[PDB]
Enzyme design. Structure first.
Site, PDB file in Angstrom:
ATOM      1  N   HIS A  40       0.819  -1.142   0.080  1.00 45.92           N
ATOM      2  CA  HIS A  40      -0.004   0.072  -0.007  1.00 45.92           C
ATOM      3  C   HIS A  40       0.903   1.114   0.032  1.00 45.92           C
ATOM      4  CE1 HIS A  40       0.068   0.468   4.610  1.00 45.92           C
ATOM      5  NE2 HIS A  40      -0.268   1.763   4.243  1.00 45.92           N
ATOM      6  N   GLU A  52      19.373   7.570   7.726  1.00 41.71           N
ATOM      7  CA  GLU A  52      18.524   8.825   8.254  1.00 41.71           C
ATOM      8  C   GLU A  52      18.457   8.536   9.840  1.00 41.71           C
ATOM      9  OE1 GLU A  52      18.015  11.592   6.896  1.00 41.71           O
ATOM     10  OE2 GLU A  52      17.252  11.844   5.021  1.00 41.71           O
ATOM     11  N   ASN A  54      17.600  12.554  11.436  1.00 41.22           N
ATOM     12  CA  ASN A  54      16.725  13.703  11.142  1.00 41.22           C
ATOM     13  C   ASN A  54      16.379  13.538   9.569  1.00 41.22           C
ATOM     14  OD1 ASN A  54      16.209  16.401  10.528  1.00 41.22           O
ATOM     15  ND2 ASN A  54      17.046  16.847  12.556  1.00 41.22           N
ATOM     16  N   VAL A  57      17.231  17.243   8.135  1.00 36.76           N
ATOM     17  CA  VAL A  57      18.695  17.637   7.983  1.00 36.76           C
ATOM     18  C   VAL A  57      19.897  16.585   7.612  1.00 36.76           C
ATOM     19  CG1 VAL A  57      20.716  18.718   9.419  1.00 36.76           C
ATOM     20  CG2 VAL A  57      18.383  19.244   9.872  1.00 36.76           C
ATOM     21  N   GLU A  62      23.777   9.702   5.469  1.00 37.44           N
ATOM     22  CA  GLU A  62      22.777   9.367   4.441  1.00 37.44           C
ATOM     23  C   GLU A  62      23.237   8.922   3.326  1.00 37.44           C
ATOM     24  OE1 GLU A  62      22.954  12.818   5.913  1.00 37.44           O
ATOM     25  OE2 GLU A  62      21.077  12.949   6.868  1.00 37.44           O
ATOM     26  N   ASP A  84       0.166  -7.322   2.363  1.00 34.82           N
ATOM     27  CA  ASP A  84       0.546  -5.991   2.227  1.00 34.82           C
ATOM     28  C   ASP A  84       2.242  -5.938   2.363  1.00 34.82           C
ATOM     29  OD1 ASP A  84       0.558  -3.379   2.015  1.00 34.82           O
ATOM     30  OD2 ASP A  84      -0.393  -3.045   4.069  1.00 34.82           O
ATOM     31  N   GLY A 175       2.240   7.108   8.377  1.00 33.52           N
ATOM     32  CA  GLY A 175       3.517   7.626   7.823  1.00 33.52           C
ATOM     33  C   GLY A 175       4.610   6.390   8.512  1.00 33.52           C
ATOM     34  N   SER A 177       3.806   3.227   7.945  1.00 29.86           N
ATOM     35  CA  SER A 177       3.361   2.246   7.215  1.00 29.86           C
ATOM     36  C   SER A 177       4.662   1.810   6.500  1.00 29.86           C
ATOM     37  CB  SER A 177       2.448   2.630   6.316  1.00 29.86           C
ATOM     38  OG  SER A 177       1.210   2.845   6.758  1.00 29.86           O
ATOM     39  N   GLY A 178       4.858   0.442   6.088  1.00 32.80           N
ATOM     40  CA  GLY A 178       5.913  -0.192   5.158  1.00 32.80           C
ATOM     41  C   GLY A 178       7.163  -0.373   6.264  1.00 32.80           C
TER      42      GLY A 178
HETATM   43 CA   LIG Z   1      19.148  13.351   7.706  1.00 37.19          CA
END
Ligand SMILES: [Ca+2]
Ligand code: NA
Length: 223
Positions: A40, A52, A54, A57, A62, A84, A175, A177-178
């Site tokens: 979904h 990640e 933040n 930022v 990253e 799902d 947010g 989800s997954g």
């Molecule tokens: Ca970051």
């Protein structure tokens, strides 16, 4: 994540953020080239953001790597959210370091009461909405299939598990989800659905990853 805490920076090195202009779903790194997430969460273009803490930022760990292939489970039901699950092949391999690491697929399905770690950048408020910059964490146990079915009569397939707290206050939310549910270093759940979030007797519902080891290894071997 409601009722959680801010994770130590980069302490969940398999957590990714899926980004399409902004964060919209979580995922889990399971191979240098592959992320698992919820079907979904599907979009035709996705940038995977690894390392990640933040998401607002650049902190210097990253890696931003576009998806080259996005494969939903062939039996994903967009209505019930049965099956799902989806796999994302990265356009280049993630470099694995202390801040970016894979998580094992499960040896067996998790027993009821197994302690897990749920994480993501989803909503932290059960009344209103607030979206965090920093990765949130929640310790939560696997619930028995009986308890899961009593919370959601006739709605829990064999491909679904409940993880959380029947009393309310502690759950994944919009947010998340997954994203991952990891128990003893193994990915047992994918954040899937619930009836709102953190409500009494409406624990989070998660894709039962231990049903999908064959499908994941097949898909990786074929692509
Ligand atoms: Ca970051
Ligand atoms: Na939830």
């Amino acid at each position: 994540i409601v009722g959680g805490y801010t994770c130590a920076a980069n302490s969940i090195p398999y957590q990714v953020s899926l980004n399409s202009g902004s964060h919209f779903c979580g995922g889990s790194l399971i191979n240098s080239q592959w992320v698992v997430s919820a079907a979904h969460c599907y979009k035709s273009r996705i940038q995977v953001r690894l390392g990640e803490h933040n998401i607002d930022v650049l902190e210097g760990n990253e890696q931003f790597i576009n998806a080259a292939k996005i494969i939903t489970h062939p039996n994903f039901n967009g209505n019930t959210l049965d099956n799902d699950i989806m796999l994302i092949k990265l356009s280049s391999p993630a470099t694995l370091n202390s801040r970016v690491a894979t998580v094992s697929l499960p040896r067996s399905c998790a027993a009821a009461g197994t302690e897990c770690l749920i994480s993501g950048w989803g909503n932290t408020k059960s009344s209103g909405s607030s979206y965090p910059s920093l990765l949130q964490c929640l310790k939560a146990p696997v619930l028995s299939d009986s308890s899961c079915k009593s919370s959601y009569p006739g709605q829990i397939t064999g491909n679904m598990i409940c993880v959380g707290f029947l009393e309310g206050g502690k759950d994944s939310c919009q947010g998340d989800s997954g994203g991952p549910v990891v128990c003893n270093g193994q990915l047992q759940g994918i954040v899937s659905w619930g009836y709102g979030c953190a409500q009494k007797n409406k624990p989070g519902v998660y894709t039962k990853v231990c049903n999908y080891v064959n499908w994941i290894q097949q898909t990786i071997a074929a692509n």
